[PDB]
Amino acid sequence: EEKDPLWLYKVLLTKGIEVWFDIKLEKYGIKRNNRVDYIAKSSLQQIVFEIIGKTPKNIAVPTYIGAYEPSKPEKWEEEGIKYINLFKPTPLMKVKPVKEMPEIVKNLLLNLFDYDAKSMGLFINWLAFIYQYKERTGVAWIFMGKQGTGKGLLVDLLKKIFEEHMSSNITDANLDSQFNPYLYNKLIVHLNEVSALVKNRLKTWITDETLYINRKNMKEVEIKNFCNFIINSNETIPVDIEDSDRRFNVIECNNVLKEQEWWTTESYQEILNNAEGFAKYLAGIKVDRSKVNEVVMSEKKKAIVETTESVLKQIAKALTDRDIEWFLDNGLEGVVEKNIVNDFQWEELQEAITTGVIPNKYLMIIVEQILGDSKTITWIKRNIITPYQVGETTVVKMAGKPIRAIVVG
Amino acid sequence: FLDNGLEGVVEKNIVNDFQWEELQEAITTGVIPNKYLMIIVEQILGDSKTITWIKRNIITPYQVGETTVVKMAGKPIRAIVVG
Ligand SMILES: [Mg+2]
Numbered sequence: 001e002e003k004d005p006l007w008l009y010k011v012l013l014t015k016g017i018e019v020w021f022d023i024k025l026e027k028y029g030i031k032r033n034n035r036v037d038y039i040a041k042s043s044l045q046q047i048v049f050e051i052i053g054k055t056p057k058n059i060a061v062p063t064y065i066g067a068y069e070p071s072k073p074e075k076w077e078e079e080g081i082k083y084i085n086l087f088k089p090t091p092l093m094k095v096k097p098v099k100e101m102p103e104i105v106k107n108l109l110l111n112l113f114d115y116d117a118k119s120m121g122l123f124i125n126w127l128a129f130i131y132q133y134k135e136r137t138g139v140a141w142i143f144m145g146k147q148g149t150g151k152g153l154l155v156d157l158l159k160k161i162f163e164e165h166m167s168s169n170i171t172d173a174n175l176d177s178q179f180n181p182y183l184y185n186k187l188i189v190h191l192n193e194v195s196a197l198v199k200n201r202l203k204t205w206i207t208d209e210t211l212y213i214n215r216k217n218m219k220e221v222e223i224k225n226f227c228n229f230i231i232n233s234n235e236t237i238p239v240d241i242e243d244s245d246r247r248f249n250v251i252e253c254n255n256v257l258k259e260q261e262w263w264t265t266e267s268y269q270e271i272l273n274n275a276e277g278f279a280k281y282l283a284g285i286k287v288d289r290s291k292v293n294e295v296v297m298s299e300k301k302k303a304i305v306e307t308t309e310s311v312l313k314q315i316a317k318a319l320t321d322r323d324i325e326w327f328l329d330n331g332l333e334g335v336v337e338k339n340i341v342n343d344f345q346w347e348e349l350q351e352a353i354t355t356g357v358i359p360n361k362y363l364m365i366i367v368e369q370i371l372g373d374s375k376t377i378t379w380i381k382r383n384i385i386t387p388y389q390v391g392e393t394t395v396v397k398m399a400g401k402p403i404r405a406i407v408v409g
Numbered sequence: 410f411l412d413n414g415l416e417g418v419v420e421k422n423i424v425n426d427f428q429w430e431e432l433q434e435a436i437t438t439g440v441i442p443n444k445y446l447m448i449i450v451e452q453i454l455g456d457s458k459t460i461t462w463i464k465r466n467i468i469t470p471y472q473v474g475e476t477t478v479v480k481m482a483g484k485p486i487r488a489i490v491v492g
Contacts, residue, residue, distance in 0.1 A: 299472060307470040328487060329476045331443050331460030372459040
């Protein structure tokens with residue numbers, strides 16, 4: 001009966017509206033003035049009526065799959081499936097390259113990294129890559145330290161720049177919510193640790209190819225992941241950081257802005273008015289692609305790790321490394337002061353750690369002394385030697401007598 | 410530390426007049442022998458904490474400084490060097 005299956009599509013394109021049926025979401029999509037919405041059929045029929053004066057029974061539009069592919073065009077076709085793009089660049093994403101960064105913006109950035117070019121520049125190279133290439137980095141930045149260091153200002157600054165493609169000030173509460181639209185179509189995702197660790201999920205988000213997106217009144221849907229994560233915190237460790245970590249750059253900043261020379265009142269606002277300037281700068285970076293996903297052992301990251309990691313691990317590692325110095329650094333020499341051991345035995349005890357051959361009665365003496373109360377061989381085995389594979393419990397003949405000892409290796 | 414009752418170390422004879430000078434000197438100079446660090450932190454907090462603990466729960470998380478040997482009165486001493 002119908003002559004054209006897409007007449008309505010075209011007539012609405014004539015008027016600068018692009019309508020489609022999104023087979024994946026079973027929802028009609030609509031695109032005007034770089035704003036994308038998804039609406040049910042009735043809602044579309046109501047829009048169509050207003051624009052052509054006829055409510056057709058049949059919505060004569062193409063079936064596409066909406067997909068947030070920033071690099072890809074307005075539309076494409078992989079294999080045989082027609083896709084349509086949900087990424088539309090914001091104003092300050094489409095802006096002309098420059099080589100100079102606005103000076104008052106630069107002072108913020110300098111202030112924030114405590115004037116350390118290495119890490120600061122690395123963050124610009126990250127931020128640039130996100131801006132320019134619009135992919136997932138596989139690294140995240142934690143900014144901790146006291147308030148008013150312009151962590152929050154950096155967020156507003158960028159928020160102005162990425163507009164909708166960024167989520168701001170996402171909290172633990174938002175995560176406990178069953179929905180999670182703060183990851184739908186987001187190049188940047190900012191989090192605010194607040195209570196003075198449920199964000200460990202984020203670890204996987206940084207590197208996962210895809211996310212599940214539960215949105216209200218929409219189908220749970222799996223999507224390609226373009227997220228990059230910043231986390232603001234104020235002296236509280238938001239995430240359990242492994243010693244050997246490759247995801248997190250950590251940047252302590254305690255340079256309050258209101259304690260600097262350069263800070264006027266109009267500074268706060270001035271910074272934000274230079275968003276375009278800072279966009280322009282970012283657009284003109286020449287991106288080292290190998291440095292994007294680089295992480296560094298900042299002073300703060302080290303402090304976080306050496307407090308997060310288990311003391312029993314640290315003992316075991318000192319036993320393994322045959323590292324007397326550590327034990328002395330942690331006050332083993334106090335064994336001699338309290339006359340738990342004599343001058344002779346103390347030589348034997350140090351010898352034992354270094355040689356990596358430790359008599360039971362010295363092991364117990366060491367672990368009692370480091371930890372502050374006495375632990376049995378059994379405990380020390382089950383909670384140090386055994387889980388961290390320090391070595392084996394065995395016999396060795398020391399002097400003539402056969403001695404129960406732990407043999408490192 | 411004096412505002413929070415460190416001077417109580419002297420009352421209970423945990424330390425003598427001589428050592429008490431060394432202990433105050435140590436805080437100010439920012440060079441603290443293990444046995445004084447423990448004495449301080451025991452005294453402020455009310456029960457004795459090991460060097461290990463004090464490292465893991467004070468020095469290390471709040472980046473107070475590092476533990477290095479310093480010779481004091483000839484003997485080499487384990488100390489916390491503020492900075
Ligand atoms: Mg929010």
